[PDB]
Design a protein around this motif. Structure first.
Motif, PDB file in Angstrom:
ATOM      1  N   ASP A 127       0.828  -1.196   0.000  1.00 20.14           N
ATOM      2  CA  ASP A 127       0.000   0.000   0.000  1.00 20.14           C
ATOM      3  C   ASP A 127       0.864   1.248   0.000  1.00 20.14           C
ATOM      4  O   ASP A 127       2.053   1.194  -0.302  1.00 20.14           O
ATOM      5  CB  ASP A 127      -0.966   0.010   1.191  1.00 20.14           C
ATOM      6  N   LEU A 128       0.257   2.375   0.341  1.00 16.65           N
ATOM      7  CA  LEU A 128       0.953   3.648   0.334  1.00 16.65           C
ATOM      8  C   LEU A 128       2.187   3.606   1.224  1.00 16.65           C
ATOM      9  O   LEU A 128       3.240   4.139   0.867  1.00 16.65           O
ATOM     10  CB  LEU A 128       0.006   4.756   0.788  1.00 16.65           C
TER      11      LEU A 128
ATOM     12  N   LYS B 192       8.097   4.419   2.096  1.00  9.83           N
ATOM     13  CA  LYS B 192       9.308   3.780   2.605  1.00  9.83           C
ATOM     14  C   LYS B 192      10.343   3.573   1.500  1.00  9.83           C
ATOM     15  O   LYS B 192      11.535   3.814   1.699  1.00  9.83           O
ATOM     16  CB  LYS B 192       8.971   2.449   3.287  1.00  9.83           C
ATOM     17  N   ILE B 193       9.884   3.140   0.331  1.00 15.24           N
ATOM     18  CA  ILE B 193      10.780   2.894  -0.794  1.00 15.24           C
ATOM     19  C   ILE B 193      11.235   4.194  -1.453  1.00 15.24           C
ATOM     20  O   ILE B 193      12.425   4.377  -1.742  1.00 15.24           O
ATOM     21  CB  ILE B 193      10.109   1.990  -1.845  1.00 15.24           C
ATOM     22  N   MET B 194      10.286   5.099  -1.676  1.00 17.82           N
ATOM     23  CA  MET B 194      10.563   6.346  -2.384  1.00 17.82           C
ATOM     24  C   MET B 194      11.233   7.407  -1.503  1.00 17.82           C
ATOM     25  O   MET B 194      12.117   8.137  -1.960  1.00 17.82           O
ATOM     26  CB  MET B 194       9.277   6.900  -3.007  1.00 17.82           C
TER      27      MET B 194
ATOM     28  N   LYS C 211       5.187  16.665  -0.337  1.00 15.06           N
ATOM     29  CA  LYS C 211       5.974  15.547   0.170  1.00 15.06           C
ATOM     30  C   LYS C 211       5.129  14.283   0.202  1.00 15.06           C
ATOM     31  O   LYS C 211       3.933  14.329   0.477  1.00 15.06           O
ATOM     32  CB  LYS C 211       6.508  15.841   1.571  1.00 15.06           C
ATOM     33  N   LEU C 212       5.755  13.152  -0.081  1.00 17.85           N
ATOM     34  CA  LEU C 212       5.045  11.884  -0.067  1.00 17.85           C
ATOM     35  C   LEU C 212       4.515  11.613   1.338  1.00 17.85           C
ATOM     36  O   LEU C 212       3.426  11.071   1.511  1.00 17.85           O
ATOM     37  CB  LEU C 212       5.969  10.757  -0.535  1.00 17.85           C
ATOM     38  N   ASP C 213       5.287  12.014   2.341  1.00 23.33           N
ATOM     39  CA  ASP C 213       4.908  11.790   3.729  1.00 23.33           C
ATOM     40  C   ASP C 213       3.728  12.674   4.137  1.00 23.33           C
ATOM     41  O   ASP C 213       2.912  12.283   4.971  1.00 23.33           O
ATOM     42  CB  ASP C 213       6.104  12.026   4.654  1.00 23.33           C
TER      43      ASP C 213
ATOM     44  N   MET D 252      11.759   0.331  -6.565  1.00 23.02           N
ATOM     45  CA  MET D 252      10.399   0.377  -7.115  1.00 23.02           C
ATOM     46  C   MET D 252      10.318  -0.118  -8.548  1.00 23.02           C
ATOM     47  O   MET D 252       9.372  -0.804  -8.921  1.00 23.02           O
ATOM     48  CB  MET D 252       9.831   1.800  -7.066  1.00 23.02           C
ATOM     49  N   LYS D 253      11.304   0.251  -9.356  1.00 18.12           N
ATOM     50  CA  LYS D 253      11.261  -0.053 -10.781  1.00 18.12           C
ATOM     51  C   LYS D 253      11.239  -1.553 -11.073  1.00 18.12           C
ATOM     52  O   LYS D 253      11.058  -1.960 -12.221  1.00 18.12           O
ATOM     53  CB  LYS D 253      12.421   0.616 -11.518  1.00 18.12           C
TER      54      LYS D 253
END
Ligand SMILES: O=C(O)CNC(=O)C(=O)O
Ligand SMILES: [Fe+2]
Ligand SMILES: [Zn+2]
Ligand SMILES: [Zn+2]
Lengths: 487, 10, 6
Positions: free
Chosen positions: A157-158, A163-165, A185-187, A216-217
């Protein structure tokens, strides 16, 4: 100069420069000025607050006070001067009401969309219709098995994404009610997404592209059939070792920063989100897999009648009319649920509603089978761009350059080789041949335009290199025809 | 307005 | 909010 004009800060007069531009915001409490990039705010907040209220004050002044919602039916929901104006597509008021009559839009025909159970059936039906070269209808694939499409296992999920990005990864995000895009921001998005009860504003990003993230890729990839026809993928092959060396040894290498990054997007939207009618940039095709949630697409075939209606809709300043209401019944409704995948060919006009919190992996690509339609959409975009002033980031990155390179690095070689033997391309390469002509004809128009009024900004292909490629293209093309006239 | 897929190329 | 551009 003048201390009162000093950030901030930063403690400086002129900011070093995402991009601060040359912009300041003033504290309504302590009255000191801050460079926007020094105010602690994110771009999405710049317009939100009636009072601010910097970090040097919040513990003893309270949090910034946002404008009160005065006109929920307007993008400028905070402006009392717009109270009396019309309901804008798709403001909060507009979406709210649209959600109630929404399901009255007619379902598509069999020639518009073809629904299949899994990737194996898709493959069969795809081939019946002539495959990618003759790809005109949209497909919905209920079960991804057989698509050869790498995706995360649910439970993803998000949280995993941030965490990855990275919590500070900035993504262009749509302020749905304001119908605008801002960095966030993603956060920050995750905090807002996590709060399901308190959502004064809805957010939806479509543009988190992760093809340059090594983790991710590998987790979400396009279907194999998409990878095999992607023009970008053909020109920037993610190869290694000797294959990569051969790549450099031919003048076939292209810089990573020149690569259009659009084939691996992550999209996350709040329930109630709406994205308005549009054609994906460059007339690119789209794959669209629902990891979590649900989407409703409203779609219209890429016909000239529809293109004319869309072009008018996009160039008119009118903001209160839903495209579907003027498209003479061309708009069809298709629902996509968790686990299901949509495959859309070039040119399809579509809006989308997000009934439930959602997480989607998708991507855009160009392919030879949709070359004409891609050029057609390109003419559409350019026509629209003459009237209205938009930003280059909402259009397909390096569209023209991509074609110069595809013609040079791919098609030219294929035509040359055929020419050097036999060899009538219509036999085992009719598709390659007809695309060459179509692409050439388009590029002849670009060339003439560049000559009539000069090159655009700096880089990337000098006019002389273009002329040299075209000369070589005309030559091999003229030769191959002679071979076709002889046989 | 401006609510549409976004890249920056590049 | 009150802003400016330079
Ligand atoms: O996810 C929606 O809100 C909008 N996304 C698109 O239109 C797309 O992926 O082609
Ligand atoms: Fe789209
Ligand atoms: Zn500063
Ligand atoms: Zn202050």
């Amino acid at each position: 100069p003048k201390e009162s004009d000093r950030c901030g800060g930063c403690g400086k007069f002129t900011h070093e420069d995402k991009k601060n531009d040359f912009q300041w915001i003033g504290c309504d409490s302590c009255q000191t000025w801050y460079h926007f990039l020094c105010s602690g705010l994110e771009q999405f907040e710049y317009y939100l607050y009636e009072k601010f209220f910097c970090p040097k004050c919040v513990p003893h002044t309270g949090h910034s006070i946002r404008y009160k919602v005065v006109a929920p039916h307007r993008y400028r929901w905070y402006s009392p001067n717009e109270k009396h104006l019309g309901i804008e597509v798709g403001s909060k008021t507009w979406i709210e009401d649209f959600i109630t009559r929404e399901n009255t839009v007619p379902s598509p025909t069999d020639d518009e969309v073809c629904i299949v159970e899994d990737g194996y059936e898709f493959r069969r039906e795809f081939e019946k219709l002539g495959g990618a070269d003759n790809w005109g209808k949209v497909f919905m694939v209920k079960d991804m098995d057989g698509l050869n499409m790498t995706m995360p296992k649910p439970g993803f999920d998000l949280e995993d994404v941030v965490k990855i990005m990275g919590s500070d990864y900035e993504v262009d995000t749509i302020d749905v009610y304001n119908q605008s895009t801002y960095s966030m921001k993603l956060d920050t998005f995750r905090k807002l997404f996590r709060d399901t009860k308190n959502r004064p504003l809805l957010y939806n990003f479509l543009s988190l592209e992760f093809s340059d993230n090594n983790e991710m890729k590998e987790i979400a990839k396009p279907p194999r059939f998409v990878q095999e026809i992607s023009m970008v993928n053909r020109l920037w092959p993610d190869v290694s070792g000797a294959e990569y060396i051969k790549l450099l040894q031919r003048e076939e290498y292209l810089p990573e920063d020149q690569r259009p990054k659009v084939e691996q997007f992550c999209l996350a939207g709040m329930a109630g989100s709406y994205t308005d009618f549009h054609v994906d940039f460059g007339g690119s095709s789209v794959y669209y897999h629902i990891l979590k949630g649900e989407k409703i697409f409203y779609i219209a075939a890429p016909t000239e009648q529809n293109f004319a209606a869309y072009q008018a809709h996009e160039t008119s300043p009118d903001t209160t009319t839903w495209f579907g209401d003027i498209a003479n019944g061309a708009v069809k409704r298709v629902v996509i649920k968790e686990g299901q995948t949509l495959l859309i060919p070039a040119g399809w006009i579509h809006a989308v509603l997000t009934p439930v919190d959602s997480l989607v992996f998708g991507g855009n690509f160009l392919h030879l089978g949709n070359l004409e339609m891609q050029m057609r959409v390109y003419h559409l975009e350019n026509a629209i761009r003459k009237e209205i002033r938009s930003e280059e980031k909402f259009y397909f990155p390096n569209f023209e350059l991509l074609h110069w390179m595809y013609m040079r690095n791919v098609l030219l070689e294929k035509i040359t080789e055929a020419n050097q033997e036999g060899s009538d391309m219509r036999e085992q390469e009719k598709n390659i041949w007809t695309a060459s002509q179509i692409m050439k004809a388009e590029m002849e128009r670009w060339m003439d335009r560049e000559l009539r009024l000069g090159p655009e900004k700096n880089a990337i292909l000098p006019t002389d290199d273009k002329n040299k490629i075209m000369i070589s293209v005309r030559k091999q093309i003229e030769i191959q025809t002679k071979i076709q006239n002889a046989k | 307005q401006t609510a549409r897929k976004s890249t920056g190329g590049k």
